[PDB]
Amino acid sequence: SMEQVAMELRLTELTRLLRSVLDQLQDKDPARIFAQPVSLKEVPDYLDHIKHPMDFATMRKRLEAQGYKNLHEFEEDFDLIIDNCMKYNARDTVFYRAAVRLRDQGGVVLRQARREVDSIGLE
Ligand SMILES: Cn1c(=O)ccc2cc(N)ccc21
């Protein structure tokens, strides 16, 4: 149907915008601490602590499969990256502090992304 196609076009547009947001957010992690999943080989107890791991590579895979239907779903995964890290690692670690900086700097990007999704009407 034409309606289905139109819906798919909107999703494709959302995916394009979220790809830009994702690139901007990942730029705020220059250490690449959050680039890849935490290695379960190197951190064998990780899943005892963290029930829903997340990282930028995993987000990018979902994004390219057009698996984010709206911005909230994308934000939920970004928040997992930060929140998981701030629980597993103590305040006096480079990991926790990287997450705080990513949260603080990412908030600016997400603030405007929300306005853009709303104004263009991508959800
Ligand atoms: C425990 N942990 C995190 O929580 C986040 C990122 C990270 C990166 C490496 N390379 C090792 C451990 C890590």
From Swiss-Prot:
<protein>
    <recommendedName>
        <fullName>Bromodomain-containing protein 1</fullName>
    </recommendedName>
</protein>
<feature type="domain" description="Bromo">
    <location>
        <begin position="9"/>
        <end position="113"/>
    </location>
</feature>
<feature type="cross-link" description="Glycyl lysine isopeptide (Lys-Gly) (interchain with G-Cter in SUMO2)">
    <location>
        <position position="41"/>
    </location>
</feature>
<comment type="function">
    <text>Scaffold subunit of various histone acetyltransferase (HAT) complexes, such as the MOZ/MORF and HBO1 complexes, that acts as a regulator of hematopoiesis. Plays a key role in HBO1 complex by directing KAT7/HBO1 specificity towards histone H3 'Lys-14' acetylation (H3K14ac), thereby promoting erythroid differentiation.</text>
</comment>
<comment type="subunit">
    <text>Component of some HBO1 complex composed of KAT7/HBO1, MEAF6, ING4 and BRD1/BRPF2. Component of the MOZ/MORF complex composed at least of ING5, KAT6A, KAT6B, MEAF6 and one of BRPF1, BRD1/BRPF2 and BRPF3. Interacts (via PHD-type zinc finger domain) with unmodified histone H3. Interacts (via PWWP domain) with dimethylated and trimethylated 'Lys-79' on histone H3.</text>
</comment>
